Structure formats: C-alpha cells, structure tokens
Design a binder for this molecule. Structure first.
Ligand SMILES: O=C(O)c1cc([N+](=O)[O-])ccc1NCCCc1ccccc1
Ligand SMILES: O=C(O)c1cc([N+](=O)[O-])ccc1NCCCc1ccccc1
Length: 254
C-alpha cells in the first residue's frame, strides 16, 4: 500500500501512501486525540504498523546543525514552551511519553515542534526510573525535558551516561547525592544502595552558564529529585521565564 522513500531510523520509514507519511514497523484510542504539539497517529495496522504524519527534521539534527552558533534563546524558549503544552495535554489525558529525547522531537518550517516516538540512550532518564521505581509518574517526562532544555542552551548533553550507574552517578555529581532530606523515601528505592558515594551539590550557575536567572529557576524545578516536588507541565507554562515567549521561524536546511 506504501511506496517506501527512505529509512528514518522498531524501524521507521518515510513512505508514500499520495500522502507522505512516517510508517513505523513494530493504542487506537490515541488516534482520536489531537494537539498541535503532538505527532498525529493516522492509522494502526496489525497483520504491528503505526502510520504517523511526517515531519522533515528532528531537534537532534537541528541542534547538530546549530552547534557552531547555538539555537537562539527566543527559539529555545518557543520550543520549550510548545513541548510543555504538548506534555500538559498528554498528562491531562493520563498519557506518559517515558522516552523523551531530542531525536523524538520533530520540527517543521513554521516554527512548530511536536512530541513523537512515544514509549507506549540513558541521558534523559529520570532518577526514579534508574533507581527502580515501578510506578513512575508524569514527572519522568518533565525531567527529560529539563535535560533537553539544558542541552539546547549549552550545546552539550547535561548527563551523558554510558551505563545505568554512570548515568545515576553523573546526576549525583551535579545535583548532589540525594538523601531523605531532599527526597523522602529515596533510600527505600529498589536499586538504592547505602554504598552510593555522597557527592555535594554543585553550584547551579556553573551547569547552564549563559542562561538567565528565570531559565535557571525553571530548570531547577524541572530537575528536582523528588517527583512530588518536580514542577508540572501546566505549572511550568506559568513560569516567569515565558513572560516574553514568541514563535520565531527557524532556519531549516532540508
Ligand atoms: O515524521 C514522523 O512522524 C517521525 C516519526 C518517528 N517515530 O519514531 O514515530 C520518528 C521520526 C519521524 N520523522 C523523521 C524526522 C527526521 C528525519 C527526516 C528524514 C530522514 C531521517 C530523519
Ligand atoms: O509515538 C509512538 O511511537 C507510539 C507508539 C505506540 N506503541 O504502542 O508502540 C503507541 C502510540 C504512539 N504514539 C501515539 C501519538 C499520539 C498521541 C500521543 C499522546 C497523546 C495523544 C495522542
């Protein structure tokens, strides 16, 4: 039914129906849900295939293309604001993403960005997932988005771990080793070990330097250890960081 065009990255292909779509080779309630910052799910076929609307670039490629100059702050702010709108919608319908990362974030020439590749490589994982919590919450997505925010600002991954424990210890070295004071119940997590090294929390203005105090404040709330203290998508949208948000159009080379 579909003329393959190319492989995007189960497997995902750009395909032609004359509609151009993204065809994923490996739910139906999601087809009826609609938000400007969420990729549209067009079809489900089980004979498992998912058919999605097609967008031409992802944030990972755009950040690489922007590496030598960086993404302008107004565009970083617009993208973060839009991604939070998408998450606030998802979370209000009790849908988690669980695997947010720059290559899952799709952009177009109009200035829009959309959530894709839902989890329905460790760099964006929330600490409660790494510590073995089985019933994690909408807060895991806010953590991932905070990591992506930091990466847009600094042009380097915040926590580029190469193993589960290296990921955890990279988080601890920056944010401090969590304890019961800042995260009640952390020492009862399934994979918590009393033998974890105890690192002090680094000064936060060292971590995303050029970012102003509004952005650092928001980031800090997105990276709270306690999922119950971590800011919600809805509350983040009201943060003073977004008082001057606009929707710039990006320079895309396709
Ligand atoms: O356009 C979608 O819907 C989509 C969906 C998924 N996904 O995992 O569902 C993953 C990527 C998607 N776009 C690809 C945009 C970047 C891209 C464009 C051309 C070649 C290589 C890479
Ligand atoms: O994005 C994927 O790759 C994906 C994968 C599966 N799955 O079961 O593998 C199932 C759904 C998937 N996206 C659905 C996106 C539409 C959507 C998302 C959130 C709220 C409202 C509407």
């Amino acid at each position: 039914n579909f003329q393959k065009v190319e492989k995007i990255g189960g497997v995902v292909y750009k395909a032609r129906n004359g509609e151009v779509v993204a065809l994923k080779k490996i739910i139906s309630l999601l087809k009826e849900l609609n938000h400007p910052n969420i990729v549209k799910l067009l079809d489900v076929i089980h004979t498992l295939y998912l058919v999605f609307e097609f967008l031409h670039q992802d944030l990972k490629k755009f950040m690489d293309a922007s590496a030598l100059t960086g993404i302008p702050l107004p565009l970083i702010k617009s993208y973060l604001f839009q991604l939070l709108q998408g998450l606030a919608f998802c979370h209000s319908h009790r849908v988690l993403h669980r695997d947010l990362k720059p290559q899952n974030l799709l952009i177009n020439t109009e200035g829009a960005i959309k959530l894709a590749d839902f989890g329905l490589t460790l760099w964006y994982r929330a600490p409660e997932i790494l510590l073995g919590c089985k019933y994690y919450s909408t807060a895991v997505d806010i953590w991932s988005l905070g990591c992506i925010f930091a990466e847009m600002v600094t042009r380097r991954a915040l926590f580029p771990g190469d193993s589960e424990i290296d990921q955890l210890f990279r988080i601890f070295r920056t944010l401090g080793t969590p304890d019961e004071v800042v995260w009640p119940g952390v020492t009862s997590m399934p994979d918590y070990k009393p033998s974890f090294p105890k690192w002090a929390r680094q000064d936060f203005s060292k971590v995303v330097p050029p970012l102003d105090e509004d952005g650092r404040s928001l980031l800090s709330q997105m990276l709270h250890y306690d999922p119950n203290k971590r800011i919600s998508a809805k509350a983040a949208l009201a943060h003073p960081f977004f008082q001057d948000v606009t929707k710039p159009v990006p320079h895309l080379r396709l």
